[PDB]
Structure 1
Amino acid sequence: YHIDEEVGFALPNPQENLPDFYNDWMFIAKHLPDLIESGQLRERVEKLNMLSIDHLTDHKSQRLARLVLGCITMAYVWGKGHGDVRKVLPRNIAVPYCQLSKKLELPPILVYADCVLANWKKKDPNKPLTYENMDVLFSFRDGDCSKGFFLVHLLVEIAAASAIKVIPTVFKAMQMQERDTLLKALLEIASCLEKALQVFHQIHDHVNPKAFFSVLRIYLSGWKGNPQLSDGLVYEGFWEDPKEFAGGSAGQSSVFQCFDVLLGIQQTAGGGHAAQFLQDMRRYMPPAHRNFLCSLESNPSVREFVLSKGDAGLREAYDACVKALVSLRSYHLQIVTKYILIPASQQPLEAKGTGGTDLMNFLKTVRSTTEKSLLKEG
C-alpha cells in the first residue's frame, strides 16, 4: 500500500527536481515568495505554453509535478492574499494539472499528500530524520513558517507510522487466538501514538500564530463552500463549468484516519456532517492510501475481539490506544485555539476550516466519538 517502516506514508526521499522539459514550471514554483510580492506572478503564469505531461517518467516525478502545479495554482488563485482573487485558471497550466490529477486519481488542487508527504528533502543523507537535517522543497511567502508547519506534520506521520508496522501482528494475533501477543502489540501502538503527541509539541517553536493565520492559511484554502469562489474554480479548456474542490487539511492524511478504523472508532458512520467530511477526504488521498484504509476496514473488529474476552489487561491495552487518540485531539484543539481562534479575534456565524468543516463542532464531535469508544471494564 506504499508504506515504509522508516517514514510511513511519505515518499522515502521524494523527487526534488523534474525533467528539463518542465523548466517553465519549476522556475515559478521555486521562486513563489518573490513573484507574489512583486505582483507579477499572474502575468508569468498567464504568459505560458501548454506543456504536455507525457515526459514525466514515474510516480515520484508525477508527485513532484502535482506539488509544483498545485502550489502554482494556489499562488495564482489567491495572489498576494488580500482579496484580489482569480475565478478562472489559464488553459496552459490547468489542462496538464487536470490530466496529471486524473492519472494519479486525485483532485486538481493542493492536498496533504502534495504539500507535506511530497514536499521535503534530507540535507545531509547520512544523519537521522529531524528538523535540523530536513527542509521543505517549497514555501509560499517569506515568513510564512511553511518549513515548520509542513515538517511538523511529516514528523508526526513518521512517529505514528512506527505503529503501522505493528498492525499485521494485531490481526494475526486475533486470528491465531494469541492473547499475549495482541496485548503487547496494542501497547506498542499506544506507545507510538504517545510519542507522536510529543513530536506535536514543537509546532509552537517552528510556527508563529500570526504568520500562519494571515499569510500561509490563505494559500492552503480551497474553493468548496467558499464565499470568495462560491460557484468554484474554472479549469479552462478541460472543464465546461466551475468545479468545487475542498482545500487542504491534515484530515486528508491516512495515518490520522487509520487508527480510528483499526480500533473500531466509527468516525465515518452515522451520516452526520463530520463523518461525511472524513469519508469525502479519502478521495483527496492517493489511491494506495485509500486502499490501506479499505483493507483495514475489511478486517475483523479489534474492538469486538477485546470486549468478547473478559480480560482487563487486554481492555486496558486497547484503552491506551483510544486515550492516546483523545490526547492528540485534545491537544489539536489547543493548537486550533492558539493558531486560529485567537488570531481571528484580533481581526478588524460559524468559523470555517480550510477543508470546509464547521471546525469547532467538527473537531469536538470527532473527539467526542473517540471518547465514547473507551471500554472501561466491559
Structure 2
Amino acid sequence: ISKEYHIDEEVGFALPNPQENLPDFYNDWMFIAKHLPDLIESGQLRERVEKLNMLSIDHLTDHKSQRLARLVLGCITMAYVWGKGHGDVRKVLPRNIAVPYCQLSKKLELPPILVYADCVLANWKKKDPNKPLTYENMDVLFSFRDGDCSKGFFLVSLLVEIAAASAIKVIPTVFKAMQMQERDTLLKALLEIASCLEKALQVFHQIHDHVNPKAFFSVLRIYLSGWKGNPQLSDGLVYEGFWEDPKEFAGGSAGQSSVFQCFDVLLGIQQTAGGGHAAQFLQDMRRYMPPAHRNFLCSLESNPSVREFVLSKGDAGLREAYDACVKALVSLRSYHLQIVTKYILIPASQQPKLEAKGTGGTDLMNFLKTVRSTTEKSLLKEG
C-alpha cells in the first residue's frame, strides 16, 4: 500500500505538504539556508557556517522536520563547498554542521549530500492550499543564487514527477490483473500508465518558460554537483568530527527519481542489467533515494514480468498497450535529450574555450543515449 512505501496517491514519491519551518532551536540553520543568495553574494556564507555551534538533531521529532532539516543542511553544504561557483572550493565541512548532518543522514538512510528527494520532493509549497498543484500556485523553499532559476528547475522536475507518479497507483492493479488472469483490467491499467507518462511529457514543456539556459548552466549546475569522480574534490569531502577520511558522494540527478526507474523495472526495460556505466549509475542511485522508495523499486523486481505475460498471450491489444507505455518513456527521453542540448550543450559551447559531465557524475551524452536506446529496444513493434 501507499502507507508501506510512502507513495502518496496525489503526489507519489514527493513528500506531501512539506514542512516550511523548523523548531526555534534551529533558527541559526534556517537563517543561513533562507539567505544563501545574500550570504554567497556578500562573501559571508562560509563565516556564518564556521560560526555555528553544534546543534543536536534530537529536537526534530517527526519525518517532515527531519526532511526539512536535511534540505536546509544539504543546501548549506552545497553553498559552503562550492561558494560563488567560480573555483574557490572547501574540502572540509566544519564539524558543527557535518556532525548533525551525518547523524540526520544516517537516521534517514540517505548520504550526507543534497539529493533529488530533498531538493525536488521536499523543496516546495503551495501558495494557496485551496488552489491545485500547478506552477502558478507553487514555490520552492530554498534557492542558491538570485536568478539561478531553481524555482523553475525544481518545480518543473516536481510537476513532471507528480504527473508520471499518478500511474504508480495503477501498479498493484497490473500485478493483481496478471495474477487473477484478468485480461481487460490489465489492458486498461497499461493504457492508464501510458496516458500518465504522455501527460508527464506535456508537463515537461513548461521548462522553456521558467528556466534560462545561461542561468541554469553557469549558475545552478554548480550547486547540484557532487564529490564523486569530480576533479575539484578528487578524494571527496571531509565530514569533520564524523569520519576521519574524505568521503565521495555523487551530485544530484533525476537518476535518483524513483518514478522513471520503477516504470523501467515494471516494463522489464532492464536499465540496471549487467555491467556498463549506465546500469551501475542507476543501481548506485537507489541508495540516494528514501529507504521506502528503494524498497518499492526492488519489490517490483521480485514480481513476475509484465513484459513476459504480454508476450505469452498472442493479444495485439495487450502488446499495443504495453508498447504505448514504452513509447511514452522513449518520447520523454528523446525530449529530455533536446533539453540537454539547449540547457547544457549550447551554453557549454559558448564558454571561453574530456566528455560533458552531468551533476550526477555521468558522461551524460553516452549515458542518456544508452538509457534511451535500451527503452526503444524494449518495443515489441516499431520496425
Q: TM-score range, shorter-chain basis?
A: over 0.9
How big is the shift at 1:48?
1.1
Within the candidate set 93, 96, 100, 1:92 is matched to: 96
Instruction: Give me the whole-angstrom Cα distance separating, in 1, the residues matched to 2:34 and 2:52.
Output: 16
How big is the shift at 1:272?
0.8
Instruction: Give me the whole-angstrom Cα distance separating, in 1, the residues matched to 2:112 and 2:56.
Output: 16
1:306 alignment counterpart: 310
Whether contact under 8 Å (1:111, 1:252) holds in the other structure is yes
How big is the shift at 1:175?
0.3
How big is the shift at 1:376?
1.8
| SS of 2:255 mapped into structure 1 | helix
Distance 1:47 1:153, change over 3 A: same
2:372 alignment counterpart: 367
- For each residue in 1:185-234, what CA deviation from the matched residue of structure 2 results, as whole angstroms up to 9, or x when unmatched? 10110000000000001100000000000010000000100010101111
Instruction: Give me the whole-angstrom Cα distance separating, in 2, the residues matched to 1:256 and 1:75.
Output: 29
The yes-or-no answer on 1:337 pairing with 2:341 is: yes
Whether contact under 8 Å (1:326, 1:367) holds in the other structure is yes
Instruction: Give me the whole-angstrom Cα distance separating, in 2, the residues matched to 1:114 and 1:200.
Output: 20
Distance 1:116 1:359, change over 3 A: same
Instruction: Give me the whole-angstrom Cα distance separating, in 2, the residues matched to 1:259 and 1:233.
Output: 34
Percent identical pairs in the alignment equals 100
Within the candidate set 139, 142, 145, 1:141 is matched to: 145
- For each residue in 1:17-45, what CA deviation from the matched residue of structure 2 results, as whole angstroms up to 9, or x when unmatched? 00111111000000111000001110110
Moved over 6 A (4+): none
How big is the shift at 1:245?
0.3
Instruction: Give me the whole-angstrom Cα distance separating, in 1, the residues matched to 2:373 and 2:165.
Output: 24
Instruction: Give me the whole-angstrom Cα distance separating, in 1, the residues matched to 2:27 and 2:366.
Output: 44
Unmatched tracts of structure 1, length 5 or more: none
Instruction: Give me the whole-angstrom Cα distance separating, in 1, the residues matched to 2:31 and 2:382.
Output: 60
User: Aligned residue pairs: how many?
Assistant: 378
How big is the shift at 1:4?
1.1
How big is the shift at 1:259?
0.3
The yes-or-no answer on 1:376 pairing with 2:381 is: yes
Instruction: Give me the whole-angstrom Cα distance separating, in 2, the residues matched to 1:160 and 1:208.
Output: 24
| SS of 1:373 mapped into structure 2 | coil
| SS of 2:136 mapped into structure 1 | coil
- For each residue in 1:252-277, what CA deviation from the matched residue of structure 2 results, as whole angstroms up to 9, or x when unmatched? 01011110001011000121110000
Whether contact under 8 Å (1:315, 1:377) holds in the other structure is no
Whether contact under 8 Å (1:136, 1:150) holds in the other structure is yes
Instruction: Give me the whole-angstrom Cα distance separating, in 1, the residues matched to 2:267 and 2:41.
Output: 47
How big is the shift at 1:377?
9.1
Whether contact under 8 Å (1:159, 1:193) holds in the other structure is yes
| SS of 2:238 mapped into structure 1 | strand
| SS of 2:58 mapped into structure 1 | helix
Instruction: Give me the whole-angstrom Cα distance separating, in 1, the residues matched to 2:57 and 2:265.
Output: 36
How big is the shift at 1:162?
1.1
1:40-59 equivalent positions in 2, closer than 5 A = 40-59=44-63
1:244 alignment counterpart: 248
Q: TM-score, normalised by structure 2?
A: 0.98
How big is the shift at 1:365?
0.4
Instruction: Give me the whole-angstrom Cα distance separating, in 1, the residues matched to 2:319 and 2:106.
Output: 44
The yes-or-no answer on 1:318 pairing with 2:322 is: yes
How big is the shift at 1:168?
0.8
Instruction: Give me the whole-angstrom Cα distance separating, in 1, the residues matched to 2:19 and 2:260.
Output: 24
Distance 1:377 1:171, change over 3 A: farther
Unmatched tracts of structure 2, length 5 or more: none
- For each residue in 1:332-371, what CA deviation from the matched residue of structure 2 results, as whole angstroms up to 9, or x when unmatched? 0001000000110000121111111111000000011111
How big is the shift at 1:155?
0.6
